[PDB]
Structures are given as C-alpha cells and as structure tokens.
Design a protein around this ligand. Structure first.
Ligand SMILES: [Ca+2]
Ligand SMILES: [Ca+2]
Length: 313
C-alpha cells in the first residue's frame, strides 16, 4: 500500500475563484491567478499579489484584449527581468509586469495557425517556455475546451521568440514540468493529461525539439478529475496535484506509480509552488477556492528565475 502522510496545512488566503498558478517573483513576492472570476457571465479573470503576512489580496491585472476578458491560469517568473509569463485560456500567452501592465505574446504560432488558449507553463534552464493549451482558439473565437475531445496542444516559446506547436491531440493537457540533468541540461518534459489519469513524458533534444512520447506515470482514482499542477523537489521527486482525489501524489524520478501520497484537508488540490530556498509548499484548491501551505520533506527544485545568467559554477 502506498504510504500516505498528513502534514499540517495552514490556510493563507481564500475567496479566489479557481485559485491557480501560484508563483514567486524575483523579489520574493507571491502571486496567484483567479481564472474563474466573471462579470455579467463573461470572463474577467484576475492576477493577484498576496501579502503573506496578512493574507490580504491586491488585484494587479485584469487582462483584456479588444473587450475580451481573460482566464489566466498558469504562471512562471522570468529570469533576466522580473516579469510574469501567464498562460491564459482565452488570450494565450501573456507577459505581465508587476505594475499590472501586460502584453499579448502571440495570436498565431510559427506555422501561422491561430493560437489556442493556454493553461500552464514551465521554463527549462535554457530559457525556453513549455506550455500546455487545453482550450480551443483564443478570443475572439468561441470558448471551448478539450475535456471531452482530443484537440489540446503543447507549445514551446523559444528564447529567440518563436511560438512552436510541438504536439497535439491531448485530452486536456494540464500540468507540465521539466526534468533537468545534474549539470542543468533539460532532458525530460512531463505533461499531465487530466481526465485520462496519465502523465506523459518526452525526451528533450533541444529547443522545441521533443521525441519519444511515452506514458510516464499513472494517476490513482476513478473520480472525475486528475493531475492538475506539478513541480519537482530538489531530489527530482515530482509532486502532482490530483484534483478531486483529496491528495497530492509524489512520484520518483522514474515515474510509474506514486511512491507516496499527501492527504489534503480538501478534495480539489489544483496547483502548487515552493517558496524559494525552503521546504514550504503553497497549494491552491477549488473546494474552498483558497491557498494553503505545508512543509515538505526537502527544498524545491530551483525555478528558472532562481538561476544565474552570469554565474561561474
Ligand atoms: Ca492547471
Ligand atoms: Ca508551480
């Protein structure tokens, strides 16, 4: 039987519709996105900064392009500039400044196709951004999602600014993570396909170059939902939020079946993020639409924004 641990969870903040994309910037500030905020039945998603002391929220950005509101769902902090890359289910990929100003990255990919709505993104150490796109075409196109049909795609936004679709035909690709070698070279891309209860992997051969698609891991449960967000700890164990299972699964470097499970005091864990240089993990969940934190067994794997461009070692 898979061992299960029940760490102490401390509530940080609440009342954040669809609480997602937890992220820390280069200054140590904490942000979260609220993709499910609606005004008059239309999308009006928000990007928020949270004060870790009081738990008070501040809306820094409410993305909108030509009257079309966004559904921000995933975040990554850049390294060479303190700015956030945000995956939006309606607007695609956005780059957001801490002052609240934002820019739409692309309306079409490298092959001239309309961009699809995105949900999550992950930087590899070379600066390439891997993105999951479970939604259909971005606004003004009618909103649709690949929960039932297989039209979700995977993109790679390269360092030289190219938006390349690297694969498609996924039934709601969601969480994504990059496994790196000890020397820092990116070598494995892990992608969650939510409803199918599978984690897929690819070997990374270079920027926007992936091959050897394989079923990497299996998510437990027959409940509606599945793997949502994920991140690696310093030993390369992959922690995966299993939405609807009340647990966060822990996979070893080689995948397969979970080697441990973390029971949460809520049914819908969605995403998570480690606070830099600590064992503290912040988790967002959709039962109470809140953010919690708990202590893991070790520090998290450094995010791209924590690495040095001009380092020696
Ligand atoms: Ca997600
Ligand atoms: Ca994360």
């Amino acid at each position: 039987e898979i061992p299960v641990i029940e760490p102490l969870f401390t509530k940080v903040t609440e009342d954040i519709p669809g609480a997602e994309g937890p992220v820390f910037d280069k200054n140590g500030d904490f942000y979260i996105v609220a993709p499910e905020v609606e005004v008059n039945g239309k999308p009006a998603g928000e990007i928020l900064r949270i004060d870790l002391k009081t738990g008070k929220k501040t809306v820094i950005c409410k993305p909108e392009v030509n009257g079309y509101g966004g559904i921000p769902a995933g975040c990554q902090c850049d390294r060479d500039a303190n700015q956030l890359f945000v995956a939006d289910m309606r607007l695609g990929l956005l780059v957001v400044q801490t002052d609240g100003t934002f820019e739409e990255i692309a309306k079409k990919d490298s092959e001239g196709r309309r961009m699809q709505g995105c949900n999550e993104c992950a930087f590899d150490y070379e600066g390439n951004l891997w993105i999951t796109a479970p939604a259909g075409e971005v606004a003004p196109a009618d909103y649709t999602r690949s929960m039932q049909e297989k039209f979700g795609s995977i993109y790679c936004f390269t360092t030289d600014g190219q938006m390349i679709q690297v694969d498609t035909a996924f039934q709601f690709p969601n969480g994504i993570a990059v496994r790196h070698m000890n020397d820092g070279r990116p070598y494995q891309l892990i992608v969650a396909e939510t409803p199918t209860k599978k984690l897929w992997s690819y070997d990374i051969k270079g920027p926007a170059k992936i091959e050897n698609k394989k079923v990497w891991g299996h998510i437990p449960g027959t409940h509606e939902g599945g793997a949502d967000g994920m991140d690696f700890d310093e030993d390369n164990n992959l922690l995966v939020a299993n939405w609807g299972s009340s647990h966060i699964e822990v996979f070893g470097p080689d995948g397969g079946q979970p080697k441990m499970r973390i029971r949460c005091p809520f049914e819908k864990p969605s995403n998570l993020h480690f606070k830099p240089q600590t064992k503290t993990i912040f988790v967002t969940e959709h039962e109470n639409n809140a953010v919690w934190k708990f202590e893991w067994q070790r520090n998290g794997k450094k995010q791209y924004c924590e690495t040095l461009k001009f380092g020696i070692f």
